[PDB]
Amino acid sequence: KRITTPYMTKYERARVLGTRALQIAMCAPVMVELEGETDPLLIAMKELKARKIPIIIRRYLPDGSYEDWGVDELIISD
Amino acid sequence: EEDASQLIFPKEFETAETLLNSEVHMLLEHRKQQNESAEDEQELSEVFMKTLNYTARFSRFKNRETIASVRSLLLQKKLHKFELACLANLCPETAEESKALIPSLEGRFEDEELQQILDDIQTKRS
Amino acid sequence: NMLTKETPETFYIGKLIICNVTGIAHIGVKTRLDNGVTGFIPTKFLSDKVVKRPEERVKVGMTVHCRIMKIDIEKFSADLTCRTSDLMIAHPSFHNINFKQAEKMMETMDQGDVIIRPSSKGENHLTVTWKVSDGIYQHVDVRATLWINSEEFEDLDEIVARYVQPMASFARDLLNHKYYQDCSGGDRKKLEELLIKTKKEKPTFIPYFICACKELPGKFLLGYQPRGKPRIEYVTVTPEGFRYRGQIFPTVNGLFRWFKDHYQDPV
Amino acid sequence: GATPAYGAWSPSVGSGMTPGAAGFSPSAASD
Amino acid sequence: MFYHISLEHEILLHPRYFGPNLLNTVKQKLFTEVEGTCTGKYGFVIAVTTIDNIGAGVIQPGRGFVLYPVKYKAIVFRPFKGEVVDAVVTQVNKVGLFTEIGPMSCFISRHSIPSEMEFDPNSNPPCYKTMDEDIVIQQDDEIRLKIVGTRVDKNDIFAIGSLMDDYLGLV
Please give the angle made by the CA atoms of C40, C42 and C46, to the nearest 5 degrees: 115
- Partner-chain contact C154 B39, CB within 8 Å: yes
When scoring E80, E141, E143, E168 by the number of chain B Cβ atoms within 10 A, the one with the most, hence best to mutate, is E80
Q: At which of E80, E97, E130 does a domain end?
A: E80
Domain count, chain E: 2
Q: E97 and E41 in one domain?
A: no
E103, E77 Cβ separation under 8 angstroms:
yes
Pairing of strands E66-77, E84-92: unpaired
> What's the first-to-final CA gap in chain D, in angstroms?
45
- Partner-chain contact B54 E144, CB within 8 Å: no
Q: At which of E21, E52, E80 does a domain end?
A: E80
State how far the Cα of E73 lies from the Cα of C242, in Å rounded to an integer: 44
Q: E138 and E86 in one domain?
A: yes
State how far the Cα of C7 lies from the Cα of C129, in Å rounded to an integer: 58
H-run or E-run covering C162: helix C159-163
Q: Which long-range contacts (CB under 8 A, 24 or more apart) does B116-125 make?
A: B117/B74, B118/B91, B118/B92, B118/B93, B118/B94, B120/B73, B121/B70, B121/B87, B121/B88, B121/B91, B122/B91, B122/B93, B124/B61, B124/B66, B124/B69, B124/B70, B125/B60, B125/B61, B125/B91
Residues in CB range of E117: below 8 A, 6 or more apart: E128, E129, E130, E137
E10, E65 Cβ separation under 8 angstroms:
no
- Partner-chain contact E59 A54, CB within 8 Å: no
H-run or E-run covering B36: helix B21-36
Q: Computed over its alpha carbons, how large is the radius of gyration of chain E?
A: 23
Q: What is the dihedral of CA E42, E155, B4, B99, to 10 degrees?
A: 130
Domain CATH number, residue A46? 3.90.940.10
C258, C244 Cβ separation under 8 angstroms:
yes
Domain boundaries, given as residue ranges, for chain B: 1-126
Q: E126 and E73 in one domain?
A: no
When scoring B35, B36, B40 by the number of chain C Cβ atoms within 10 A, the one with the most, hence best to mutate, is B40
Of C227, C183, C232, C189, give the one whose Cα is nearest residue C206.
C227
Q: E165 and E89 in one domain?
A: yes
Interface membership of A5 toward E (CB under 8 Å): no
Q: E113 and E63 in one domain?
A: no
Residues in CB range of E44: below 8 A, 6 or more apart: E37, E38, E76, E77, E78, E103, E104, E157
Domain CATH number, residue E10? 3.30.1490.120
Q: Is E54 exposed, middle or buried (0-12, 13-18, 19+ CB in 10 A)?
A: middle
Q: How many CB atoms lie within 10 A of CB C173?
A: 14
- Residues B1-126: name the CATH superfamily: RNA Polymerase II, Rpb4 subunit (1.20.1250.40)
State how far the Cα of E8 lies from the Cα of E53, in Å rounded to an integer: 10
When scoring E18, E22, E60 by the number of chain A Cβ atoms within 10 A, the one with the most, hence best to mutate, is E18
Interface membership of B39 toward C (CB under 8 Å): yes
DSSP secondary-structure letter at E104? Answer: B
Q: E18 and E64 in one domain?
A: yes
State how far the Cα of C108 lies from the Cα of C65, in Å rounded to an integer: 42
Instruction: Find chain E residues with C-beta within 8 A of A23's C-beta.
Output: 15, 18, 64
Q: Which long-range contacts (CB under 8 A, 24 or more apart) does C176-180 make?
A: C177/C210, C179/C207, C179/C208, C179/C209, C179/C210, C180/C209, C180/C210, C180/C211
- Residue numbers of the domain that contains E33: 1-80
State how far the Cα of E79 lies from the Cα of E87, in Å rounded to an integer: 13
State how far the Cα of C168 lies from the Cα of C239, in Å rounded to an integer: 9
Please tell me the distance in Å from C91's CA to the nearest CA on chain D.
Answer: 24
Q: What is the resolution of this structure in A?
A: 2.9
State how far the Cα of C21 lies from the Cα of E79, in Å rounded to an integer: 64
State how far the Cα of C156 lies from the Cα of E76, in Å rounded to an integer: 40
State how far the Cα of C136 lies from the Cα of E66, in Å rounded to an integer: 42
H-run or E-run covering E71: strand E66-77
- Residue numbers of the domain that contains A13: 1-78
One-letter amino acid at B64 equals R
State how far the Cα of C133 lies from the Cα of C216, in Å rounded to an integer: 13
Residues in chain D preceding a C-to-N separation beyond 2.5 angstroms (breaks): none
Q: E64 and E53 in one domain?
A: yes
Q: E168 and E89 in one domain?
A: yes
DSSP secondary-structure letter at A23? Answer: H
Q: Of the candidates B16, B27, B90, which has its C-beta nearest E86's C-beta?
A: B90
Q: E69 and E106 in one domain?
A: no
Chain centroid offset of residue E61 CA: 39
Q: Computed over its alpha carbons, how large is the radius of gyration of chain C?
A: 33
Domain count, chain A: 1
Nearest CA in chain E to B58: E86
Provide DSSP, C101-131.
TGGGGTSSS-TT-EEEEE-SSSSS-EEEEEE
Chain centroid offset of residue B122 CA: 14
State how far the Cα of C192 lies from the Cα of C216, in Å rounded to an integer: 18
Q: Of the candidates E5, E36, E83, which has its C-beta nearest B45's C-beta?
A: E36
Domain CATH number, residue E136? 2.40.50.140
Instruction: Find chain C residues with C-beta within 8 A of B37's C-beta.
Output: 151
Please tell me the distance in Å from D15's CA to the nearest CA on chain C.
Answer: 7
Q: At which of E58, E80, E102 does a domain end?
A: E80
Q: E69 and E33 in one domain?
A: yes
Query: Bridge partners of E7?
Result: E72
